[PDB]
Structure 1
């Protein structure tokens, strides 16, 4: 009934009687805690005595009662401090719950304590009694032989020694299962931690374990060197392949390394490979000559451009301004991309006479997308349109140098020095409007061409095109400085451009220099936080429009709540309409990897009173959700297609087409009604210039490269982030703000190709791998898994999503080593029985290589 006999002895005199009282109380503390709660100061006084030795028992009793009160933190101290009253080795409701809390305490702290000092766990800073309970939790976990728990608690609690020991110890080098655990932490450590400092340490140390080699995944080995850009990891990577040289291993790696890595690293790695002693094999793979040949191959065989459709479009009206010509020029170039097909231009040369100056520049340049892929006849076609050979028009002449830069971008090396001279040359004089447009094309083209690689000579040149303040050329120049100096910028470029934006006056310049300033900040994060503050603090619309993108780019990939919050604040409260649109677009890029969250964010914001918000959101949702499904997403854009304002209709149509390329054609029943609608608008002449503009370019994206090639961001054909892609869409968002900006969509058309592959050197095998597959080379626009034969399984249209269900068989000369790669942009099955039966049909790459 009462605890009163016991409690009476707890206050009675003599140490012995108090020792007995503690142990009498002990047995039933839990049930009677309420009464015993009043006696806590008395119990606490025994605890504080260091002469009385049943202090530990008094503490234990205190803890139980505090737990029942809600003071979990206080009891956790008190059990440790007792020096035996923390025992996890018993199993209880008390014990389980306060252990749950203890980990929470260490983890919270561990966030703070890492930031001050990254050796804290190594040291007395978080007290040994706590650190022991945590270390025992690790051991507890490991015993259960489920590694994801052990690694979890330690990741949150910033202990590197535990992440290493966990991977090390358990290795059977089953062997696959340890490797799986390694790959799960890797994806995780980048996408869930935002701290640089932690993430690098894990990534280099895990590289070593994979580098030992008995079962290791090449894609993952490659990823961690790309992100961190460290020369030492690359040196070891290459040094390993010398020792364990196989044509198979060596291709796989180089083929990864040519997609994922950026140019300036690419170069720095090659420099090291030569200095270490080199393989001539890798240097050919890194050319990207193979990938451009593959693309050509694909498009030639798999065609279905539907020029009857484009013919259909153009001919419905020639009204609705010179904008109407700009659209069908742009839809031509997308349809015919890398297939080589001039159909619009052959027919209409009167059409060119209709077209304005700026439309004529898009039309020349559209040929730049068409002959992209050939890096030999790409220059060749543009030759009759160069200076020293003149042109038909100066308006053509300008678009020629923009089309060449499209073709040769990221391998512009020679042409760049050439183009630089035209630039430095017409800064001295050339205020005639024909020479400005010439100076314009050179400036656009060269920024594309030197993109991703520092050239201070490029920065310097262009800055003087800016000092002329041409409304025409300044735009070009400005992007060109951002495009080149991509990376981490310099302190210099930031302060010099930003001051200069207030000093000089033009609208076109202000828009160009803002986007210019954003571009240099990629992967920066907190180091970019300083220029973000300055731009948002400018009360100029142009700079604030640019300000969003800076966050977008700096944080590009890594989801950050702080970064997105800054864009939400600018977006809602500013009066200026333009800034709202730019800023919703900007949300998508941070949130690229949390693409499930986008349908909830833009569920609200498609219902707005300002049209600018609605247009920007069709694009926002579209960008982020491009690389994968999202049917719910397609349901939002539905109202926006028929939204009362013309520019909201435009933007929904364009947006819709970038996601559903070969998910179209009755996969989703609705998509037929959307495709039909695209047709209806064009055929109608009671639809406005921007609405029909919107229908016409959206037709080009869907039907891009003969219905075979796709709009990605957060790729499923290369599987990693691409610089080309984020930047490319940002140019894309402006196309009425300045007209020839479309062509940067060129930079991120990706092949869906399903081809035979060899681990060994190429010769073009083509064979079906017959695994069961859905209908989506049978559902494309118009003129499951079960493990059975299927109708077509090599080439066709297919889908990136479907390609993963068709996996390379062991039943020929082609051997799996990956159970299919998971990507489908460069192929690769490993060929273990070279120059044998299993097809043989040489491509055009084997006519010169």
Structure 2
């Protein structure tokens, strides 16, 4: 029966063996009678408290079990850890499972604390805690799949057991890539990110064949230009080349300009010149330009039926940029040449906009562009806009062109010319961190010429983009709270926002200072700065800050910016974005609604979510006009390069755009948003897409920068062309050798059908006798009597959502070597001799 617990009195004796027997019996019967031993408490504890007792460990185990039954695990862990061996190593009972779970929770919390302060100040860890933790690690390792020990380790830092897990049998190294995914998806500690990446690259290096793609995509985060430079050097000296060519191509497609400049500088300290040429991006830019030119197809019919619908309002400017979006990087000014009287029908800043559109059409033309800009436009507005457009062409790719703009700013009329020249110089020298350009733009800002300073702020932000120069931010803010001309404040807003791009918590004191500043433009700038500093990673602290500002602040502009920052904060996880903004879209004030629409447009890039589309469906009927314009622009941005089979609202939204643009009594801003949406939907001739994410899951800094300064068009129309930096070509290039583009034939896996390029009186009844007449006429009349795939060549455009439905050209003699499951540029593994089919148009 065992219905009594008088054995506890055996602990009250003095002989040791009595206490040992009582402790053993209690441990045997803890699971049932914990009610009585709950009152013993101290009598057991003193047994462990005395050092001279023989079996203090058994007493500690009994007390731990009793406390666990009570529920106060914070002491059950202590008393279990105090006991040794038989305490938990049995790993058999549910009590053991609970104790190990709780103690390893304590261990991981303590590991986080130690990682916070690793400067010797880190608190010590009981060696028994480490022992049970790594015993659990080894048990779950030798037990089954090792994809749980890795997660526990990266939770508790513990890079040693991480390396042990990956370096053990590990089944296949594929899980390593899975770990990499975790390292880039479900962790926000940059300090831990560095160590995890270093471990990953070391593990890649010690393999028989290092995974060059993974190590390069880790080193781009690690910011080690000399490391990847010597990696390329040893790859070349290993007679590999092809993989080095690839690694360079993804390096340019993902890494920042300064990283590539440092890499080429280190390489400068036969094959090496080719390496430098493709690292500078000449070949990549030429290939992208060739793909855009050859695959250019813009439906001028929609532009025709729009240009006859404009009532000579200001919307012409929007059309001026809309076709530009449809002709970005396609060098196709066919509409501009064909329709020229209306091109000249607009002047003042519209001339600036037209020249900017002409330049942005000729995006990435490189050597030709210098004389090309003069050919069409050889008038302060004209020259300023030409300088701005030349800056547009060489976006992040200026080089010697920078020098031109440099001198082209010194000889300026201190007017619109200076504004355009500064904007172009800042755009082209994006992130170059050159001291001379910074000093010249600082002088331009100090000129205090309103519009000139307005452009100088953006230029100084672009040149200092993500630089975190203390001098830069100091001078910028010192001018920010010293000058009038609120336009210059608007420029300096984005200027200081861009200097802190993606820096995370590198300096949040500036965000606090900007949010606490009295000037409303300064608070708007603070929200923009938090958006730029926390791009990608959905840091909930920053999202909470901006939501609180958007809900509590009094200025409508800062609320708009705070809501718009949601896109910049959540583009990496587009699913969460409609959830939060499901109701931001229904505020009592319309500014928050516009911010909600813009955030919806920014966060999900081109995903056919059909949830953001659903939210924007009724909002485009809002009585307020500018919220309708923002909704139209956002719906266009989310719905680029999509069709009816992809989502059932593309044709409906196209005809809605037409029916609002052709309307006459609607607000000018509503039709402005309509034509902007028309330009965005078919932007780039159905050949480019906007995506802040890169191919390898990296954040594309030019894309986010450009979309931010495009959303900054409420205060300045000329900034709209900046959206050009957000487009990425949706192409895959069949380049095998250094200069060969063989006609390799590969198909797709389109299941149901094909998709992609979309589109190119009354009679009265008189029922008296009409029925009889018709029936007798009827008697008189009686008396009278799909593919599933497409063959493609080297410059083949592939939809971003269709990047996984391709087929390996195994039927062809030549098959690629790089994993062909994503867009960009790939390599082709060339088979045996008799190589032919050379294409070079």
Counterpart in the other structure of 2:440: 461
1:201 aligns with 2:192: no
Do the aligned partners of residues 774 and 657 (structure 1) sit closer, same or farther apart at CA in structure 2, a change above 3 Å counting? farther
CA distance in structure 2 between the partners assigned to 1:292 and 1:51 by the alignment: 79
Counterpart in the other structure of 2:799: 799
Do the aligned partners of residues 811 and 56 (structure 1) sit closer, same or farther apart at CA in structure 2, a change above 3 Å counting? same
Counterpart in the other structure of 1:48: 49
Do the aligned partners of residues 166 and 71 (structure 1) sit closer, same or farther apart at CA in structure 2, a change above 3 Å counting? same
Deviation at 1:418, TM superposition (A): 2.3
Aligned partners of 1:248 and 1:830 also within 8 Å = no
Aligned partners of 2:735 and 2:827 also within 8 Å = yes
Counterpart in the other structure of 1:769: 746
Aligned partners of 2:816 and 2:827 also within 8 Å = no
* 1:321-470 correspondence runs (5 A): 322=314, 324-384=315-375, 391=378, 393-426=379-412, 430=413, 436-470=415-449
Summarize deviations over 1:480-504 as a string: whole Å, max 9, x none. Answer: 1111112332112222221221211
Counterpart in the other structure of 1:132: 131
CA distance in structure 2 between the partners assigned to 1:532 and 1:318 by the alignment: 44
- Structure 1 gap segments, 5+ residues each: 845-849
Aligned partners of 1:335 and 1:706 also within 8 Å = yes
Counterpart in the other structure of 2:840: 843
Counterpart in the other structure of 1:586: 565
> How does the TM-score come out when normalised to structure 2?
0.92
Residue 50 of structure 1 aligns to a residue in which SS? coil
Deviation at 1:752, TM superposition (A): 1.4
Aligned partners of 2:703 and 2:725 also within 8 Å = yes
1:257 aligns with 2:256: no
1:312 aligns with 2:310: no
CA distance in structure 2 between the partners assigned to 1:30 and 1:60 by the alignment: 13
Aligned partners of 1:103 and 1:153 also within 8 Å = no
Q: How many residues align?
A: 813
Counterpart in the other structure of 1:295: 288
Do the aligned partners of residues 409 and 23 (structure 1) sit closer, same or farther apart at CA in structure 2, a change above 3 Å counting? closer
Summarize deviations over 1:484-541 as a string: whole Å, max 9, x none. Answer: 1123321122222212212111111010112111111123222221211111111111
Do the aligned partners of residues 520 and 278 (structure 1) sit closer, same or farther apart at CA in structure 2, a change above 3 Å counting? farther
Q: Answer with 67-76 or 393-402: which moved more.
A: 393-402
Deviation at 1:137, TM superposition (A): 1.2
Aligned partners of 1:483 and 1:520 also within 8 Å = yes
Do the aligned partners of residues 236 and 710 (structure 1) sit closer, same or farther apart at CA in structure 2, a change above 3 Å counting? same
CA distance in structure 1 between the partners assigned to 2:87 and 2:14 by the alignment: 29
Q: Answer with 212-221 or 305-314: which moved more.
A: 212-221
* 1:219-258 correspondence runs (5 A): 219-258=213-252
Counterpart in the other structure of 2:30: 29
> How does the TM-score come out when normalised to structure 1?
0.91
Deviation at 1:129, TM superposition (A): 0.8
1:284 aligns with 2:296: no
Deviation at 1:183, TM superposition (A): 1.7
Counterpart in the other structure of 1:611: 590
Aligned partners of 2:748 and 2:790 also within 8 Å = no
Do the aligned partners of residues 265 and 577 (structure 1) sit closer, same or farther apart at CA in structure 2, a change above 3 Å counting? same
- Structure 2 gap segments, 5+ residues each: 761-786
CA distance in structure 1 between the partners assigned to 2:293 and 2:493 by the alignment: 41
CA distance in structure 1 between the partners assigned to 2:518 and 2:23 by the alignment: 71
CA distance in structure 2 between the partners assigned to 1:727 and 1:495 by the alignment: 21
Do the aligned partners of residues 666 and 359 (structure 1) sit closer, same or farther apart at CA in structure 2, a change above 3 Å counting? farther
Counterpart in the other structure of 1:546: 525
Summarize deviations over 1:745-768 as a string: whole Å, max 9, x none. Answer: 11232221244331x223222333
Summarize deviations over 1:723-748 as a string: whole Å, max 9, x none. Answer: 10111011101224112001111123
Aligned partners of 1:485 and 1:520 also within 8 Å = yes
Counterpart in the other structure of 2:774: none
Do the aligned partners of residues 47 and 352 (structure 1) sit closer, same or farther apart at CA in structure 2, a change above 3 Å counting? same
Counterpart in the other structure of 2:769: none
Aligned partners of 2:445 and 2:456 also within 8 Å = yes
The Cα RMSD (Å) is: 2.3
Aligned partners of 2:606 and 2:639 also within 8 Å = no
User: In structure 2, which of residues 608, 611, 632 is the aligned counterpart of residue 653 of structure 1?
Assistant: 632
User: In structure 1, which of residues 635, 638, 647 is the aligned counterpart of residue 614 of structure 2?
Assistant: 635
CA distance in structure 2 between the partners assigned to 1:140 and 1:793 by the alignment: 52
Counterpart in the other structure of 2:474: 495
Q: Answer with 767-776 or 518-527: which moved more.
A: 767-776
Counterpart in the other structure of 1:829: 828
Aligned partners of 2:565 and 2:599 also within 8 Å = yes
Do the aligned partners of residues 319 and 738 (structure 1) sit closer, same or farther apart at CA in structure 2, a change above 3 Å counting? same
* 1:524-539 correspondence runs (5 A): 524-539=503-518
Residue 487 of structure 1 aligns to a residue in which SS? coil
- Structure number with the bigger relative contact order (C-alpha 8 A, sep ≥ 6) is 1
User: In structure 2, which of residues 180, 184, 199 is the aligned counterpart of residue 186 of structure 1?
Assistant: 180
Q: Answer with 153-162 or 722-731: which moved more.
A: 153-162
1:733 aligns with 2:719: no
Residue 488 of structure 1 aligns to a residue in which SS? coil
Deviation at 1:227, TM superposition (A): 1.3
Deviation at 1:583, TM superposition (A): 1.0
Do the aligned partners of residues 29 and 3 (structure 1) sit closer, same or farther apart at CA in structure 2, a change above 3 Å counting? farther
CA distance in structure 2 between the partners assigned to 1:155 and 1:816 by the alignment: 35
Do the aligned partners of residues 494 and 797 (structure 1) sit closer, same or farther apart at CA in structure 2, a change above 3 Å counting? closer
CA distance in structure 2 between the partners assigned to 1:512 and 1:543 by the alignment: 11
Aligned partners of 1:254 and 1:282 also within 8 Å = yes
Aligned partners of 1:666 and 1:779 also within 8 Å = no
Q: Answer with 307-316 or 203-212: which moved more.
A: 203-212
Deviation at 1:444, TM superposition (A): 0.8
Do the aligned partners of residues 834 and 669 (structure 1) sit closer, same or farther apart at CA in structure 2, a change above 3 Å counting? farther
Aligned partners of 2:34 and 2:70 also within 8 Å = no
Counterpart in the other structure of 1:847: none
CA distance in structure 1 between the partners assigned to 2:749 and 2:278 by the alignment: 32
Deviation at 1:167, TM superposition (A): 1.9
Aligned partners of 2:67 and 2:73 also within 8 Å = yes
Larger radius of gyration: 2
Summarize deviations over 1:385-435 as a string: whole Å, max 9, x none. Answer: 67xxxx4x4322221111111112223222222222342344xxx4xxxx5
CA distance in structure 2 between the partners assigned to 1:338 and 1:422 by the alignment: 24
Residue 750 of structure 1 aligns to a residue in which SS? strand
* 1:72-151 correspondence runs (5 A): 72-117=73-118, 125-151=124-150
CA distance in structure 1 between the partners assigned to 2:337 and 2:816 by the alignment: 47
Deviation at 1:580, TM superposition (A): 0.8
Do the aligned partners of residues 92 and 367 (structure 1) sit closer, same or farther apart at CA in structure 2, a change above 3 Å counting? same
* 1:773-792 correspondence runs (5 A): 773-774=750-751, 778-783=755-760, 790-792=789-791
CA distance in structure 2 between the partners assigned to 1:423 and 1:232 by the alignment: 34
Deviation at 1:382, TM superposition (A): 0.8
Aligned partners of 1:753 and 1:827 also within 8 Å = no
CA distance in structure 2 between the partners assigned to 1:260 and 1:36 by the alignment: 64
1:152 aligns with 2:137: no
Counterpart in the other structure of 1:14: 15
Deviation at 1:381, TM superposition (A): 1.8
Deviation at 1:645, TM superposition (A): 1.2
CA distance in structure 1 between the partners assigned to 2:433 and 2:732 by the alignment: 36
